[PDB]
Structures are given as C-alpha cells and as structure tokens.
Amino acid sequence: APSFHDKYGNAILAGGAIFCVSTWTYTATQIGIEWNMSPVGRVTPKEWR
Amino acid sequence: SEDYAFPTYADRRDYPLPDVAHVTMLSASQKALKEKEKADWSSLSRDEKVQLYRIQFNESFAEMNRGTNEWKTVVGMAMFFIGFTALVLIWEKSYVYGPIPHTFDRDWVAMQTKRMLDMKANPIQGFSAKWDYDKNEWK
Amino acid sequence: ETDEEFDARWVTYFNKPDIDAWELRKGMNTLVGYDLVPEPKIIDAALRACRRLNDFASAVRILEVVKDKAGPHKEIYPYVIQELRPTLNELGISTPEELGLDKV
Amino acid sequence: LLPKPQMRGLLAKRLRVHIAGAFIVALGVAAAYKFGVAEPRKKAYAEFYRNYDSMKDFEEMRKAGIFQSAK
Amino acid sequence: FENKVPEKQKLFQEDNGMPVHLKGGASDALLYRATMALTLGGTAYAIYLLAMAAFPK
Amino acid sequence: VHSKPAREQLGVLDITIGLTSCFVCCLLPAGWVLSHLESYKKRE
Amino acid sequence: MFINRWLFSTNHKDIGTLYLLFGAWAGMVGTALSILIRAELGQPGALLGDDQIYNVIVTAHAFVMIFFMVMPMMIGGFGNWLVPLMIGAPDMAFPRMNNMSFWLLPPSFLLLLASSMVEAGAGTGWTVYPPLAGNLAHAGASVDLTIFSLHLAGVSSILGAINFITTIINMKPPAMTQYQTPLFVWSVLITAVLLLLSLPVLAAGITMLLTDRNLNTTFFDPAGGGDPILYQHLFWFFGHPEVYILILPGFGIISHVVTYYSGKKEPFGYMGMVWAMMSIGFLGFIVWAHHMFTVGLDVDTRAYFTSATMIIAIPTGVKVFSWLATLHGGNIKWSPAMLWALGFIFLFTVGGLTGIVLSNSSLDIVLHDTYYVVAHFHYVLSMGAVFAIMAGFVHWFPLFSGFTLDDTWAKAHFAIMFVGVNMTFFPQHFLGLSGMPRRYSDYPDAYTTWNTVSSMGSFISLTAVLIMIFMIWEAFASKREVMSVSYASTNLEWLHGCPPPYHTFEEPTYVKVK
Amino acid sequence: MAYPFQLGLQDATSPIMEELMNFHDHTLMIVFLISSLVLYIISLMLTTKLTHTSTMDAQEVETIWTILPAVILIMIALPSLRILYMMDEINNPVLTVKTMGHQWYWSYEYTDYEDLCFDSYMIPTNDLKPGELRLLEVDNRVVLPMELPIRMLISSEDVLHSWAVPSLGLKTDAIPGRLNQATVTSNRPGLFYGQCSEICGSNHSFMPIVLEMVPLKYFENWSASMI
Amino acid sequence: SHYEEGPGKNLPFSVENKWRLLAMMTVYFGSGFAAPFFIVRHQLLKK
C-alpha cells in the first residue's frame, strides 16, 4: 500500500503475463503468418513431375 | 551551491558510518535526548535508544537490505510493452505485408519436400536422414 | 600480514585514549572493507571507544554491521555476543536485536 | 557455548569452492555438447560412408528423370 | 619596417566587452558580417542545388 | 545517486499522454510510408 | 545569446550536449533504417521491388550507426563532458577546432542524405568496394556524396583526436603520473591515438577511389593495371582499427560504471587494464586481413593473420577477467547501469567468442559475409557499444542535466531492449551457419522462420527506443533533482555539482607532492 | 539445399567439409566451456552477499589468467593451420572449371578440350516449374564428376562477386583480373546449391549456384550431347 | 554569471513548459525516424 509496488506490482505482473501470452498467441496463430514449419513428420510428400 | 561540495549523508553496507548525521536540525527534545546520552549509560531506555538511532541514521541495515517488488514491476512493464509490440506486429501483418509468394502453398511445399528428398538433401543427419526411403514414411 | 598482529594493531589503534569521531569512523569503515568478520576483541575495543566518544548509535551500528558481515551463516552473531556478554551489560549498551531494528 | 566458526576468508573459501564448481560445470557443459552432438555426427558419417554406394545413389536419383545430363 | 607590436598590444587588452574576434575595429566586424553573408548564403544555395539534383524535371 | 522530488510531477493522465504522444508521432510517419508503399510504388 | 552560446560554443560541456543531440538524431535515423531492413526481412518477397534501394538502406544504416551515432555519442560526447572533469582540466586544449569538428558532422550527415536523394543511390554497403562504386556500376553522384561525407567525418575525427590527445597528455596536474588517470581517460587516449593513425588511411583510400572515378585514373580499374584488392587492404587497415575505436570507450565506460556501482574504491588490476588497452590498440593494426581470408591472399599470410588475431584475443580476455575480478567482493547496488554493464559483459563475451569462431581462417572460407558475421558484430557492436552507451547515458544523466532517472522505468527499458536485441540477433547464428550471405532483400524458405523471429525482436527493440525517448521526456518533465551522489571521492566528475557549471576548474586542483 | 529449422551447417559432402565440421564442433565445445564458466562466475557474484572493499591483490592471478587462455587459443589455432595445410596440399586436376561472374549472372567454362561456355541465369518465381525451390534454381546447371579433385578458377567480368557453395564447402571472391583457385571435391552425386556472397548491383540476391555431379561417363555424355 | 547556469539551464531548448517540450521532442524524433521513410518513398516515386 505505501509503496507503489506492493499490490500494483502483482497487478502489473498478472496483466503483463496475460496480455503478453494472449497477443503472442494471436499473432502467431490466428492472423495467418506461417512459421514455415519443419516438414519432417507432419506433411506427406506429394508426387512432383 | 554548497550541497555537492559539502559531505552528504548516505546509507550503504559499503560505507556504514557517514560523516554527517541523518538529521541536521536539533529540537529541544533531541537536545534533552543528547543530554541523557551524556548521562548514565544504564539509565536510557528503549524508545530513547530507537529515536537516537533514528536521528543519527535514516535507514537501518535490516530495512535497507530488503527485497522490494520493483523487479516484478519491471518484468510486468516489460511484458506490457512487448504486448504492445505484438499489437504493432498485428498491424504490420495487416497493412504493409501483401501477398506471399506461391511457392509456399501446401501442395507446392509437399512437392518441394518430395523433390529435395529425391535429391537426398544433406542426408547424413540434417533433413533426408529422418525419412524412410523404403517404407515411404518418416522416422 | 599475520592475523594476531593485525588484531593487535587494530585493538591498540581503537583503544588509543585520544581517539576522535572521524578517525573512529575511518577505522570502522576501512576494517569493514576488509574480508574479515572482526574479532570480538576488536569489537570490544570499538565499544570502549564509543563509550569514550558517547555514541549509542555508533555502537549499535558496529553491532549491526558485524551482523551484516556475518553473511548467510547466522552462527557468527550469537558467538560474538556471547563473548561480548559482560561488556554489553557493563557499558549499558543494548543489542539491536533487543532494541528492535532487526524487524520492521 | 557456541564454538568459533570460520572467521578468516569466508568469501575466499566460497570463491575457491565455487571456482572449482565453475570448472566442473564448465567441463560438464562442454561434455554435454560433446556427448550430445559431436560424436553422434561422426557416427552418422561413419554409418553413411560405410554403407554408401555412389552409383546406387546416383541411379536412385536418376530413376525419375531429373538430371538433364541423363535423360 | 617598425615595431608596431606594443601599440597593437594596447588595442587588444582593453576590457571593453568585445570578444577577441572583434577588438580590432570596424574592418573586423565588416569582415565577420561578410563571412556570415556568404557562408549562410552559400549553405542555402548548396541545399538548393542538392535538391535540384534530387528532383529531376 | 539520490534525487530531489519532481518539480513538475506527471499525473496518470500526463504519463498516458507522454507515452502515446511520441509513440504516435514516432511511428505515425513509419506507418504512413510502409502502409502505402504499394501506392507510392505506382509510377503514376 | 543563443547563437553566441550554442552555434559558437567554446566550452566542452555544451559541445558534448550538441554531440548528444546529434547522436540521438542519428540513432533515430539508424533505428528507422534497421526497421525498414527488417521490414524487408520479416516476410519473403519484394516489399520495395529492387534490392538496390535496399542496399541504399543498409549502407545508410551502417554509415549513420557507426560514424554519426556511436563515435559522437561516446567518443565525442562522453569524452568531451568527462575528460576535462576527469583530469581536472578547465576546458579542452583546442575548443575552437572541437567546435569545428562538431559543426563538421551535420554537413557529413546532410551529404549522406543527399546521397540517398540521388537516384543512383549508395548501393555498396559499408564497404565501398570498387568497381561497384565506379562509374559503370554506379553512374551517379551518390557514392561521391558518401565519400565526401566520409571526408567530413574523417577530418572531424582527426581534429577531435588531436584535441583529446593534447588535453590528456598535457593538462593533467603536473605531479600526476600518466599511469594515475581514471581508465576512461586511458580508453579515450588509446582511441584518439588509433583514430590519428587510422583516419588518414581512410583519407588515402577514399581519395584514391574519388580520383579513380572522376579523373579517369586506374587505381582499382582492372583495365589499367589497378586492383580493388588494394582498396580492400587500405579499407580494412582502416576497418579493424575503427571497430576497436567503436569498442574502446565502451571498455572505459563499463569499467567505470562497474567500479562505481560495485562499491570498489579501485578497479582490479589497473596496470593490467591499461596494458590490455594498449595491447589491443597495438595489435589492432596488424590483424586487418581477417576480413581478407577469402579474397585470395597467400596462405602463410592467412596463417599469420589468424595467429595474430588470437594474439589480439588474449588481452581482451585479460580485460574481461579483470572486470569479473573487480565485480568480485563488492556489494552490488542495483542501478540500471550495472544491468547495462552485466549485459555488456555477457553479450560482449559471446560476441567476441563468435568473432573467434570467425577468426579461424577456414571457418571464414566457409563463413565469410554470411549472417554469422552479422551476429558477431551485432553482438559486439549493436549491443556491446550500444549497451555501453546506455550505461554511460543512464549513469551521467544526473550530471549532464541535473535530473535523475527512475529505476523501475529505466530497468523496464533495459529489460525490453535486452530481450529485443537477443531475439533479433540470436537467430543469425543459424542464418549464417545455414548459409545465406549478406545484403539480401529476400531469403529462402529455410531462413524464413529465423528471419521472421529476428524481425519481431527488432520491433521489440523499436518499442524499447520508444520507451527510451519517453523516458528522456519524463525525466525532463518531472525535473526531480539530485540530493546527493556517492563515490564522488573517487570519481572527480561527480563532485563539481549536478550539473557542473559553465566554468569548471577555474581554480586548479592541488595535486599531492608525494 | 538448406532445410527449415536448421541450427548447424549443411551436412558434409567433401572431406574438407568433414574436417571443417569436426573443428567447428571443437570450437563450439570450447566456446560453450568459456560461456558456461563466465555464466557461473557472474551468477556467483550476483548471488553472493559478503563484502570486501579493501586493497585487492593484483599480481597473483593474471599469470594463470594469461597462460591458460593461451593454451586454449593455441589448441584452437593448431587445427586451423592443419586445415590450411589440407588446402595447401597438391592437386590431381582431372578437370579445370572456370567461373566468370557477369553482371547479375554467372558463366561457367569447361575448356580442357572442346571449349564450351554456358550461362547460369536466374529462374523467376512465376516461371518456376512445379516442385522446385525458390530463389535457387537455374535453368542451366553446372555439371561436375564426383570423387575427383577439380580446379575452380574463379573471376568476374565487371563487378566483384563471391562464389559460395556452403554445403560442399567453397567460398572465394570473384575479382576482375584476379582468379582464385578452389579445390572442389565431394563424395556424393546430385544437386548442390550455393549463392553469390558479394554485393554486385540490383540482382545480388538473384545469383545462385547449382552443381550436379554424376559418374564420369554421364559427364562426357552430357558434354557430347550439348554440342 | 555571464551565461545562466542551473538544472535544465545548460540545454539549448527550454524545459519549463513540459507540453512544449513534448511537442519539440515529438517533432524532433519524428523527423529523425521519418527521414529514411521519406527517402524510400522519394526513391519509389523517382523509380
């Protein structure tokens, strides 16, 4: 209470953690940037000419 | 003016005893306190002792070596502004970046994988070593 | 740089009779600078000097800085206070643990 | 009655045991990298170039009609 | 030729308030205005020529 | 280094304005150019 | 009053003020160029079109970040503030050419801006390797504008180096041994000496190139018996001394902030510190061809150059171990300057070791001009010299303006920029080992993922730049003063007021007779 | 050919690359040794609590702090000179191939008998036939035989280039009027991909290197089939 | 004395008005960050 970091410190901790993980998951997954995943194990090789 | 030139009060474990006291003004109560300090050493009690320590030194060792929550304020602020950076990245994909080259299509990626498996690209441990060439699957 | 003569020169510099506040503080600070938890004889001489110089606060600051210099292992301060048991009740000085600055 | 603990060179003894710790964990990290990836790569080369046949590899590359040297 | 240093040594130690680059008289002030009027005018003419190189017709 | 109290302390609103103020005009120019690069691209 | 005090300045405090302003502006320009480069390199494809304009962007990035940011920030700026206050001098030895060198810098930046204006562009890089910069590949004036900007910056650096050497070895108090000055003075002294011995080398090289283009001569034209390898030799005889210029005041600043906030009254091994500084200064001139391992030199010459590069590696390690030793035994005050110093120690360590991995010669025959080199010099420069600049900046700011910094927000800046530069600069190890070369506006599919990660981290670093400029505003707006400064007994600069007045050391220091 | 999520080098094909990667992980275990050491020392003095601000003794630890990193650097430097000697070994030049970096492309010359010079251009993204790699493919590949030490005489026409195939392990600057010699060997046939590594105008990113190595009989079959 | 000294008085810009200071820092750093973007748009128009 007397210093700024006693309870507002935990508040900024929780807000930053939630804000960070939510926005990073949003930008990594739901937008549509491709990470160019490692093609081992996940894709079967279609035949090329 | 003269504050930088004069010796100044400070508190650290490096320099435990500063040249100047914590307080400079002396009240009548503090003058009487110094009189009883000059008086008998077994006749001064707990609250006079603690106020003498308070007027000589500002912060005690146990209350200045404490672990306070500024560090978690730092890491929270850092996560906040990295989240704002992620917002800038959302904008930076939504606006400046246009179409992507067609070589990244799923069928094109699969045929590229088949081609560089037929070439046996770096097949000792890198990429083609994890593909079974007889069973037509991976490892 | 032998330890016994180190102790002897420190104790005689501390119990020199015309000791003053500035040189007392200088001696305490440059002994704190050493990598050495001070001898209870050295702390005894410092308490005698603060007796001559009339400073409860300097005496209990010496006690608090040897507490800090004890470090992660707590067994040093009961040891030094059980050698300085007669001089603490002889000089009327109260331990910082007694007079309540360890807790906040 | 408490006995006399270590009073001389506390940080000296801590520094000695901790630089011994520094050396052993440094060789531990180096040996971790070694036993993890250095010799497994060498064993991969040994297996590949013991079982390797260049003409067989070229023919199974050539079988799909890819090089313009061999059509 | 005559030693005119000590008489010019009296015209510069006068604590009249002018800085060292202006104590000599009206010739120095005229020359300092002249070197201001062609350096700043030259710099303004320089950035115009660079802009004319930057933007074709 | 001990510091004297702020002569002109900034309020919650002042900090808000300060942070945004620059971010705004320190990224606005960037956004404009990057966002319209394709137009700019038009030789027209 | 304004034009008398600031445009015609003759005192080193305001000269360093205007250095700091110009260095901040150049840092802004270089940050914008880096963000544009990463805008290329965050998504595959021609966002701009041709890569010639991208090469212009990277050339401006290199020139602005080296010559207009780092040297005016710590060599000009911090030196001009500190070293008269460090050695007790009332002013610099030749403040009139100090002011000349300062006001020489914005014409160099303006000539580089005009080079960017010219439609040919400076598509060469930091290296201005002919015949790319000749009349055939670059039929324009932009590279001539860059060469003249190098002339302006070079003569400014020569004048500043002369002034710094004269001030250091002349106007210390006469009873002082030269081996008794604070280590930033020694660092900037060796810096100014190497500037003096390496800046005429760039002058010779770029006059050679300018004469090669404009006057029909054949210094680097293969059709006239010349050779570009001569320009490479001259430019790297410049170049490695110049990167040691960009690192030595970093050594001094980090040593000072460590010995300040670590509680030690003296750094460990002062003689070893000064010996290591002079040793890397001496060996900085005979290792210039470690950038030359793939050009086609003689093989015994390559062996000598890599061996001498190990010989320059050893005393820097002595310097690093002396930093760890002076960190040992002291109570650590958790000011942000220690956070910058510790970041400098670890990141400079890994960058120098990356430099050693390059320094093995055949490893450059596999690894020359890839992004492994990019990772090396961005570790050791883009956050080595940058973190040292930050440490000195957040340290001496109460001395520079009178207003302190709030530790929570300042550490927030430190943490975000540390994370951003690590995320930016750690993937180029994999980018270089996987084998993509420099100066590419688009990258293959293997490098896509790490390039995207690096660009995202670069945007994190941009957000850190925003929080820094907001923090400068917040300090200048809150205007909380300095109550007291510790360790002014050992640090001479802090005892003459925060900030020191216009006329300092009007009464000379009484140095002990011994 | 580089694969996504790659942390080390493209795997070895040449024996010189085999010793390069062996020495490379030697240097990596050395740097990891030093990095872990400095990490534990930094963590030690940030995790400590005791104080020593007295006169510190200086002339006791710089002796070991000078001699043992000297041992580390000399054991780093000795295999570097060993590999340099491996490139200093004599040649068995079954073929001589000359590369001539032209403005934004390459030209490769086989001139030992029946002089032929072909042009390595750049294939575009829209003209990429299905299944290929982007920014790497060339319509005219560079044909070599396997298992043979071949001379590589490397120069450039009007601007500096840098012939760099990282998989096989070659990188030399193509300089006008100065052709460098590179010993190309391998152990496998197939395609190998590399880039230009020196800035050379408005298509610097658009100069790749493709090398296909196959049995000698197919090599002269190719060389006869063109002409 | 001859020049005014004190905290904030050794800067070439005024400090007393924090909003005016914010405006001048905003336009200063905005021009600094906007110069290369106007370079790239000027070259895109030129090309």
Ligand code: HEA
């Ligand atoms: C801050 C500037 C700076 C600094 C200090 C350095 C320092 C070093 N640099 Fe670098 N360098 C650059 C800036 C810098 N460099 C730039 C800007 C380029 C590219 C320019 C261009 O291409 O345009 C470059 C390029 C460059 C190359 C070119 C690679 C190529 O293109 O083929 C090489 C290779 O030898 C190299 C090597 C080194 C070495 C060996 C050091 C050493 O001085 C580092 C020493 C530091 C250490 C920390 C040593 C490690 C010691 C310890 C960790 C102590 C403990 C050790 C033991 C116990 C053994 N540098």
Ligand code: HEA
């Ligand atoms: C000082 C030197 C310096 C600095 C800081 C940087 C910083 C950065 N560099 Fe830079 N870079 C070079 C010097 C530097 N670089 C050189 C010399 C080259 C080679 C050019 C060539 O190939 O010819 C290069 C090349 C280079 C490339 C290669 C381009 C290519 O080959 O295609 C890339 C791309 O990722 C890159 C990225 C970055 C990034 C993302 C940053 C980020 O770290 C940017 C963030 C850093 C800062 C913002 C610095 C801090 C300064 C301030 C915050 C402002 C100062 C103001 C005050 C302190 C008040 N750099």
Ligand SMILES: [Cu+2]
């Ligand atoms: Cu170098």
Ligand SMILES: [Mg+2]
């Ligand atoms: Mg080159």
Ligand code: NA
């Ligand atoms: Na791009």
